[PDB]
Design a protein around this ligand. Structure first.
Ligand SMILES: CCCCCCCC/C=C\CCCCCCCC(=O)OC[C@H](COP(=O)(O)OCC[N+](C)(C)C)OC(=O)CCCCCCC/C=C\CCCCCCCC
Ligand SMILES: CCCCCCCC/C=C\CCCCCCCC(=O)OC[C@H](COP(=O)(O)OCC[N+](C)(C)C)OC(=O)CCCCCCC/C=C\CCCCCCCC
Ligand SMILES: CCCCCCCC/C=C\CCCCCCCC(=O)OC[C@H](COP(=O)(O)OCC[N+](C)(C)C)OC(=O)CCCCCCC/C=C\CCCCCCCC
Ligand SMILES: CCCCCCCCCCCCCCCCCC(=O)OC[C@H](COP(=O)(O)OC[C@H](N)C(=O)O)OC(=O)CCCCCCCCCCCCCCCCC
Ligand SMILES: CC(C)CCC[C@@H](C)[C@H]1CC[C@H]2[C@@H]3CC=C4C[C@@H](O)CC[C@]4(C)[C@H]3CC[C@]12C
Ligand SMILES: [Mg+2]
Length: 997
């Protein structure tokens, strides 16, 4: 696409455009129709392992290098290509089908004839789109009109930026005042919008109406926007579409899907490179021993083609089928139900994760806040003691019909029920009209709405205890008592919450009594000095914060009438002024905020998902570092980190201060370096500065931390953190998220896990693995990833060992029997054909386990051995190479030594000994025996015996039915295998593996 430019969007009239806009389609698939085959082929053959077979097959076009039949070169290559292409096509088709669900959602569109239904994928720039309550916004729009009489709406944006606060949105003032929504099409208005960009929290634009005789222009900000991926909290809204498809704010924060390859596959590719290099060195030495007798290059080519099975195609086939088995097993595990595998070629990545970068909102939490603790200083009330609070309120409001603990409880509850910015919203339950519910205060139709979910939880709790907030206006508030009596309060003044003040206040007058009261609630740090002297605020606030709760200090100051008049006069005088209005107003308000009576401390919990603490503990014990990358704000992120035990209860936490330039960043980095065993909490902008100037120093300090929390993290910042971890540590990272702001870091990570979000699916659709709950991560790693990694390592190493043993056997057979002849090549091919009788026993290794699933779950320290690369390394590969050379040499030399009679006898003895040796080798390798492995072994042995019988009768051979053959094969197999059995027994007895203890 071309460089982004500002657009003029006319309301309605999508045809009025200076360019063509992309279709409003969310796309997660890696290929289209045109790029599918070239991309799949390139990603297949760009690696040496596949390109080697491709070039081996292509060399047979030259008649000088012809060796054997063409189909022997092309049928296995074609089968591998077909398997890869079918797998990729199935993946793409499933991705398209799953995208159709999001793209086929139906919305209402304003038209001249009326309202019509439109699918999400058919939305055009300039369409007037109706979005209902709790419905996802399908495209980036400007808020124009709402049905609610307050002239505003709340947006849930956690799928877009990971923030728990509800966003208050205001419609365009001109369009909201129109008598009907149909008048939007009868005016000549347009929106001049900025170019499509990546910033989620800023927008620059203008609304212009040319129909009015005086032209009307309105500046547009982020407060007038409804981005795609947000959810309308209540009411039905109308907006004009500005951006669609790939230019959506959510989509522009999303990277292109990529084809991932596992680290194990790269290691296998390196092993194949090493094997080919050894073969080429051997060919060079062989041709040098002949002193390059002429046409030496041709002889080198024939040697490479003759021993080309040293890199067997069966390695690739077995690995592909094994990955199929692992994905099938993951999709059918009922202990982690609903798990979806999308990147089916990387199940072994789950076994080697060093850093887990997790999202907070919607991944660790349920995005549901609950009131948990009420503390009065002398008595604390929890979830089990709320009955006492209810009884206290009941007695307080019964005595009036008919100091003390009841009075203090009542004052605290009334303060919580009044000091907030929550508005009761009444809806329709079918029978009852919206106006009827607002008149009788119907509980079932009442919904509490506020930007702060903590305030909503507080008001809901006060409802559960007896004091119900039933109505609120700009100047009035109504409370319902346990005696169904309404108390009317007049909102004289309100001081709305700001993140800089970290507190909120209100002044009310009780009309039933006439007394004026000033209420304030806020964080402990700011409210400690505001309240009177006490001996329990700091300690109790510390304990409640350590529990993981969001703590608020609730205070109260009774105001005399004259005091209120004086304050009101000074406040009005400060407000009417224009010079330092904010500062003078602050002087007045914090002049009012002093010597307040401390009422209570409140504790609100952001509820964690099921088994989050055990899952995090399991990940920690396995050697995995867990970082929290969230778009939410500092306080909630810290509270959740403590609640989830991402940070230990008695663990120091360093909160990175605001830094704006290089010097401040260096100073704070030194300050944090001076600490030990301290968790790190840093915001997105300070992180930006630190990564700009001190990326290496910050990365080493953060990797030396027990835990890192990055709050207010933009999606690009999350992806950058993932990339920096990969670049610095050199280890695998796994990103876990649930929202659209996690897609970039999921795609960037070596193993992306998407949690199915409550109101969005983009993270699940873009991830390598999709889970329904965070706790499924523990099993998905410790059982499935471990087993996949170990099985792949064992299977690949055994296939390579078998091919190497065959190569050694045929090298000895060619060098010691006849040097060069046609029957020599016949025996070469016969020896090569021995893998058919060991195929099923070898592939039965995909059923092998070292421990049961419960043992792996209960002992996470087994994962650290995987983190060290133990299953596949140079040591195990070298041991396998030595074993293969020894066994091949022993079999061939025993065949040529014991009975040198003929080609037939030596071939038969070596073939039988090799088959028996590989069967015993499979038996020796198995850790936990599955009945299917026994079936494979016995079936392969029976098939070989049947081959020895079907051949004995027809071709004239009687040498099989002889004691000589029996005992010679027995001795050869014993010499090949028994040393390995003794070595295995000694290794098990002396230095057992950690999982056996
Ligand atoms: C024990 C070890 C001792 C070693 C001592 C020295 C030995 C020297 C002998 C050989 C050295 C040259 C070949 C080495 C192996 C290839 C290494 C290599 O640098 O690989 C280059 C790439 C594969 O890189 P990658 O997989 O890491 O990519 C991953 C990165 N990514 C995918 C993003 C690109 O591409 C390739 O493999 C191209 C590789 C060269 C062409 C393949 C030749 C073999 C194929 C067939 C054999 C002959 C058949 C006839 C061929 C001609 C027909 C006319
Ligand atoms: C044969 C040619 C290769 C075909 C490979 C693709 C099979 C895809 C497949 O067969 O789709 C998965 C379904 C069930 O998937 P689900 O609905 O449980 O996923 C939530 O069957 C399965 O699991 C079995 C497939 C598991 C392996 C997928 C490819 C691994 C490489
Ligand atoms: C017969 C002659 C020789 C047999 C050789 C056996 C070696 C290969 C075995 C592959 C296999 O047996 O695979 C097993 C998996 C999981 O089954 P399980 O035996 O662990 O069940 C455990 C329950 N117990 C114990 C009752 C069985 O099933 C699977 O992956 C099924 C594979 C899914 C293929 C989907 C293709 C999509 C394209
Ligand atoms: C059509 C056939 C496609 C195909 O897979 O080729 C068959 C491959 C061949 O490789 P090999 O076993 O090492 O045999 C060496 C042989 N003599 C050679 O020179 O090439 O052998 C294989 O790759 C077959 C492996 C099957 C493993 C089990 C699959 C699941 C079975 C249940
Ligand atoms: C090379 C030839 C001799 C290999 C012989 C294959 C057969 C006979 C061997 C190989 C693996 C063996 C099995 C390995 C595991 C078990 C489980 C336990 O209950 C002991 C018997 C039993 C069931 C063995 C029976 C014999 C067995 C099936
Ligand atoms: Mg989230």
């Amino acid at each position: 696409g071309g460089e982004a430019r500002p657009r003029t969007v006319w309301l309605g009239h999508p045809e009025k455009r200076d360019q063509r806009y992309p279709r409003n389609v969310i796309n997660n698939q890696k290929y289209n129709f045109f790029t599918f085959l070239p991309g799949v082929l390139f990603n297949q053959f760009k690696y040496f392992f596949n390109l080697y077979f491709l070039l081996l097959a292509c060399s047979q076009f030259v008649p000088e290098m012809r060796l054997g039949a063409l189909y022997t070169y092309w049928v296995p290559l074609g089968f591998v290509l077909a398997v890869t292409v079918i797998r990729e096509a199935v993946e793409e088709i499933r991705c398209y089908v799953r995208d159709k669900e999001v793209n086929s959602q139906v919305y209402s569109r304003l038209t001249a004839r009326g309202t019509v239904k439109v699918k999400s994928s058919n939305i055009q720039v300039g369409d007037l789109i109706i979005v209902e309550k709790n419905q996802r916004v399908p495209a980036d729009m400007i808020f124009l009109r709402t049905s609610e009489k307050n002239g505003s709406c709340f947006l849930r944006t956690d799928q877009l930026d990971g923030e728990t606060d509800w966003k208050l949105r205001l419609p365009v003032a001109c369009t909201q005042r129109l008598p009907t929504a149909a008048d939007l099409l009868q005016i000549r208005s347009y929106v001049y919008a900025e170019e499509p960009n990546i910033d989620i929290h800023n927008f620059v634009g203008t609304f212009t109406r040319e129909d009015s005789d005086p032209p009307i222009s309105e500046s547009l900000s982020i407060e007038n926007t409804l981005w795609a991926g947000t959810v309308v909290a209540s009411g039905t809204v109308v907006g004009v579409v500005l951006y669609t498809g790939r230019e959506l704010r959510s989509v522009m924060n999303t990277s292109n899907p990529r084809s991932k390859i596992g680290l194990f596959d790269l290691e296998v590719n390196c092993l194949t490179k090493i094997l080919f290099g050894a073969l080429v060195v051997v060919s060079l030495v062989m041709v040098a021993l002949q002193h390059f007798a002429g046409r030496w290059y041709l002889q080198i080519i024939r040697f490479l083609l003759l021993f080309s099975n040293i890199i067997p195609i069966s390695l690739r086939v077995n690995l592909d089928m094994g990955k199929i088995v692992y994905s099938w097993v993951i999709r059918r595990d009922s202990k982690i139900p609903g798990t979806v595998v999308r990147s089916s070629t990387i199940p072994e990545q789950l076994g080697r994760i060093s850093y887990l970068l997790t999202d907070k909102t919607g991944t660790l939490t349920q995005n549901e806040m609950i009131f948990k603790r009420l503390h009065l200083g002398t008595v604390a009330y929890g979830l089990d003691s709320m009955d006492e609070v209810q009884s206290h309120i009941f007695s307080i409001y019964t005595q009036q019909s008919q100091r003390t603990m009841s009075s203090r409880v009542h004052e605290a509850v009334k303060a919580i029920a009044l000091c907030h910015n929550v508005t009761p919203v009444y809806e329709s339950n079918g029978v009852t009209d919206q106006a009827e519910a607002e008149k009788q205060y119907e509980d079932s139709c009442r919904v509490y709405q506020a930007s702060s979910p903590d305030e909503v939880a507080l008001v809901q709790w006060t409802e559960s205890v007896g004091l119900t907030l039933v109505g609120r206006d700009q100047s009035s508030m109504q409370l319902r008592t346990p005696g169904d009596q309404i108390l009317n309060f007049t909102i004289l003044q309100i001081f709305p919450f700001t993140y800089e003040s970290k507190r909120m206040g209100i002044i009310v007058r009780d009309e039933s009594t006439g007394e004026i009261t000033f209420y304030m609630k806020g964080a402990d740090v700011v409210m400690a000095g505001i309240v009177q002297y006490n001996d329990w605020l700091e300690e109790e606030c510390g304990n409640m914060a350590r529990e993981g709760l969001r703590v608020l200090v609730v205070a109260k100051k009774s105001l005399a009438e004259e005091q209120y008049q004086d304050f009101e006069a000074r406040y009005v005088q400060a407000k009417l002024s224009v010079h330092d209005r904010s500062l003078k107003v602050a002087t007045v308000i914090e002049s009012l905020e002093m010597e307040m009576e401390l009422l209570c401390l409140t504790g609100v919990e952001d509820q964690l998902q099921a088994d989050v603490r055990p899952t995090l503990e399991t990940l920690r014990n396995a050697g995995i570092k867990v970082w929290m990358l969230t778009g939410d704000k500092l306080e909630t992120a810290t509270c959740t980190a403590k609640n989830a035990h991402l940070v230990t209860r008695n663990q120091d936490i360093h909160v990175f201060r605001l830094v704006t330039n290089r010097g401040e960043a260096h100073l704070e980095l030194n300050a944090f370096r001076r600490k030990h065993d301290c968790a790190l909490v840093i915001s997105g902008d300070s992180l930006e500065v630190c990564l700009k100037y001190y990326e290496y120093e910050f990365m080493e300090l953060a990797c030396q931390c027990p835990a890192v929390v990055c709050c207010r993290c933009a999606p690009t910042q999350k992806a950058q953190i993932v990339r920096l971890l990969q670049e610095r540590t050199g280890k695998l990272t796994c990103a876990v998220g649930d929202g659209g702001n996690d897609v970039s870091m999921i795609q960037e990570s070596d193993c992306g896990v998407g949690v199915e979000g409550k109101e969005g699916k983009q993270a699940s659709l873009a991830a390598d693995f999709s889970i329904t709950q965070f706790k499924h991560l523990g099993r998905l790693l410790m059982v499935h990833g471990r087993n996949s990694y170990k099985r792949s390592a064992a299977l690949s190493q055994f296939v390579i060992h078998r091919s190497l043993c065959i190569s050694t056997m045929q090298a000895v057979f060619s060098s010691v029997f006849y040097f060069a002849s046609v029957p020599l090549y016949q025996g070469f091919l016969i020896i090569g054909y021995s893998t058919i009788y060991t195929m099923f026993p070898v592939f039965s290794l995909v059923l092998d386990k070292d421990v049961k699933s419960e043992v792996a779950m209960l002992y996470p320290e087994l994962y650290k051995d995987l983190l060290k690369g133990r299953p596949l390394s140079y040591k195990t590969f070298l041991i396998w190479v030595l074993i293969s050379i020894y066994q091949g040499s022993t079999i061939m030399y025993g065949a040529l030594l014991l009975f040198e009679s003929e080609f037939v006898h030596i071939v038969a003895i070596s073939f039988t000994s090799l088959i028996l040796t590989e069967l015993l080798m499979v038996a020796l390798t198995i850790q936990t025996w599955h009945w299917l492995m026994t079936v494979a072994e016995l079936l392969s042995l029976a098939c070989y015996i049947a081959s020895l019988v079907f051949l004995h009768e027809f071709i004239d051979v009687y040498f099989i039915a002889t004691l000589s053959f029996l005992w010679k094969v027995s001795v050869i197999t014993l010499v090949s295998c028994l040393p390995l059995y003794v070595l295995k027994y000694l290794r098990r007895r002396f230095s057992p593996p950690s999982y056996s203890k």
